[model samples]
Target chain A: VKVCLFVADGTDEIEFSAPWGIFKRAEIPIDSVYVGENKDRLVKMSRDVEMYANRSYKEIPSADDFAKQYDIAIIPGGGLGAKTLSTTPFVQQVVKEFYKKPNKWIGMICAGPLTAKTSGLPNKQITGHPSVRGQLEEGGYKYLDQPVVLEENLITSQGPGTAMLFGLKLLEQVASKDKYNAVYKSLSMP
Target chain B: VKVCLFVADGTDEIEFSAPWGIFKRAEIPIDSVYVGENKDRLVKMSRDVEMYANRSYKEIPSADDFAKQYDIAIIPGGGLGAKTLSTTPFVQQVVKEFYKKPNKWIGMICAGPLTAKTSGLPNKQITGHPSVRGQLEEGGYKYLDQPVVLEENLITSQGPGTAMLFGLKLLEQVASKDKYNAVYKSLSMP
Candidate 1:
């Protein structure tokens, strides 16, 4: 299945990379896109590091188009990337559009729930960075304190540290439980 | 201060983003470099997501050269990215070089310690994802199951769920305890 992962200036590398790695191990075809205001050069992260983007936000496929082209849309978490992506018109638009499709999945990790909350998707028990629970609650979204929480098509995780569990759960959702188990075994997880 | 955040294919978004957010809030500059086989495209992640990288593994600034240029090296965790990065000669070179520089701080979260282990960094008090403690021990690394662990210049944390705490700890190491307190106040953390 085709997947579209969003990256932006100030995007978190681990959150994006962890799940991306899981997908690859499962042999799932995926795409990474850099989304945000700066389209040129590499986007600097908060820690004074630079990360490159696959495609600019302006060039990213519309959520409707992406939905037609892919099976899932995921938002990786980073402090700036989440804030920037959550607030971006295009990013929000994509999230909103994608949530409308049945069987299509939308997963958010750590602060990524900010974007999902912004998308106006009906809350189905979401979780995010523990520190951000206040903001999430204030936004009227349900919160699960677990490392990974799944409620219907929406899968939310705690932080970049939970990338493996996040990827495993997402894989179960998009692929098959069996496939998830297979990869988990390969990784020597129970 | 020059900071290099490592990004391999499938790195976790939150691990990279949370620290990145903290760094930006602290007004630190950051750069992201890709440490993978591929260059010039988005790296696929789970849940149909993607991340973009700036430089390829071949183009990554030599660890020694990078060490000379940067004050800190941050490694984020992703299941596949960690596995892939842990084995890469360049990543190993970079980790080994960074380990030798006592003044240079090394920050890792979740499975990031795999890189440290591969670098032959001395076994110190560390932490990792709860599910993987056995694997870590088997690799001959001391595993601390707490949300965060700090061993001298080395800092390791649980997962994306603890991204904020992890980032805050890292900030405390690089900046000052006072800076970390201020961030806690701003984020409304107790």
Candidate 2:
């Protein structure tokens, strides 16, 4: 019922926004959080772009503090932020911890899969922006080399462009096939 | 050598990231500007995520100020941002102004063709995420429902899953067929 999304400075606006909009349209309760730098106000994307936040990194409740707090954790892709999130030890740790919970969902889009790769999950089939597949392969990860890959408990999509499909697939995973079908129907997908 | 990207909080990560990463890898000089509220801070995406910005919305120079400020205007896809950018009076105006010029490249992905639709180009063929084709049709737009669309003054792809192909095509359109062929060779694409 609840989804936790990680936001950082310079994060890809589409990767974050498309899925968020899909989830909102699906009427899913979502908790968006900025994972790095404890700031109380808006986070700017690129230059001269700003988006408001519901909570800051410091305000996010510890993962261990609450069971069933979030059904999934999604990392969206961007430029500098993708680099930052991928390199951030804390973000990697969080990804590692999130994957530890059995049946919990973990989704990433675009270059966001770097965080998943850094978490070191075993035999996890994943995908990302096609160009970055080389980076994932170099990291000893299995790359699906497709737009979206759905393995057990993990849903990885190519990039921000796949956000809606990623969101619908995640919804299907967490909710039901019927829910996804309904949304797809509304969107007039076959 | 300088590329200006139109970015917003909800900009699609994959659509932008995959190409931007390629450009960066190619050592292309790129600058990004937010079209919305002017704030040089973190921009929150959907799902409670945030990204950092090097510039703010107010920093975006007037569209008509430069005859050819950007060799290409890359429009990535995301639901909310795409819808907003497509319909925003200012954004529509800017796109219209840009399309009025000659030889300037315009790249769109996922739902990004919506912006091109609003540009009032006459009967031009376009493409986008398959699900929204009806919406475009309803809006009196003409397009092909395929993996990509190459029309006069426009290059569009289905979604994030096709970001690389989109980039390759865009590169071919903006640079030269030889440049694209060189990249294709490096990527091992026949």
Candidate 3:
């Protein structure tokens, strides 16, 4: 499956990396794109880790075209990155359209799901970082108090500690049940 | 406090990122360097995430000079990256020298600590990816079943789940207790 992972400056690097790693382990191809302002320059992470994106936000189409191009859309958490990405109309567009369809997988971790709080995703049972919990509730989401929460194809996870479970869950949905178990055994998961 | 984070091809991106985020939020300075065979090229992660390093292994010094430069050493985990980095003489030198000084801190997460098992650091209380537990045992170490384990200046955490805790613990020692508490609240930790 083709996947697109989005990042803005001040992105949460770990939240982005773990799921990406799981996808690779499952042999799913992915494009880690840098979206919104300063897509080409060195993207500064919350921890000052420097990253360069393979693609720009301008390259992604809007609405249905955007949703059709990729099977999965991922947003990684960062205080500034998620907050900044939340304002970008295109990132919001992707989320809205992807959610418009039932099977499209959209994964958010830590503060990354904050964008969804405002973008529109009300009835889904989801979970996210503590800071965004109120906004998610205010947004009308049935937020579950669990590390990894899945409402059909939309997956949300708590803070940094929940990446592995989140990744495995994503793998189970996007890949196959057996595929998830294979990786679980490979990592010697408890 | 000054810190050095190491990376190589096939590196576990999440293992490197969570701690990086924690340190960044804590306002601790770190240099995430790319060491080993590939330095100048776009570094590939286990999930194919592309990363660029601030410095190369060739640029880092040997023995005391290496340990004296940075207060902490970070080893990020990847099944292949850790195994490959283990064979690098320079990496071995850095770990060996860093261990000689009781004040220096070494942080290993997931399989990244695999190198430490062979390079020296036995008899230390540690934990890692479940797959590596037996190897760690064979290497003469006491392994714990937990998220994060600390023995003096050496810190070992399990898999992708414990990175934040590992980062905060490291920050507590290198930075001020107040600093760790500040970032903790910033991330809305429980």
Q: Which numbered prediction scores highest in lDDT against the true structure?
A: 3
Ranking by lDDT: 3, 1, 2
Docking class of predicted structure 1: incorrect
What overall lDDT, based on C-alpha atoms, would model 1 receive against the true structure?
Answer: 0.70
The TM-score obtained by model 2 is 0.64
lDDT of 3 at B155: 83
Error (Å) of candidate 3 at residue A96 is 2.1
Q: By the lDDT metric, which is better: model 2 or model 3?
A: 3
Sort by DockQ, best first: what order? 3, 1, 2
* Residues forming the 10-long window of minimal summed lDDT in candidate 1 chain B: B45-54
TM-score for each predicted model, relative to the true structure = 0.59, 0.64, 0.85
A1-190: candidate 1 lDDT, tens digit per residue: 8877777666665667666766777888877676656647466644434555556656646656766767777887778878887887777777777674677778888788898777787776788888789988877777876778877777888865566678778888777778877776644232
Off by over 4 Å in 3: A39-42, A124-126, A137-145, A188-190, B37-42, B122-127, B130-152, B185-190
Stretches of candidate 1 off by over 4 Å are A186-190, B1-190
The candidate 3 chain B region of ten consecutive residues with least summed lDDT is B181-190
- Which predicted model would earn the best DockQ? 3
Please identify model 2 stretches exceeding 4 Å from their true place.
Answer: A8-22, A41-54, A75-103, A108-152, A155-169, A182-190, B1-4, B7-64, B74-102, B108-120, B128-141, B156-168, B176-190
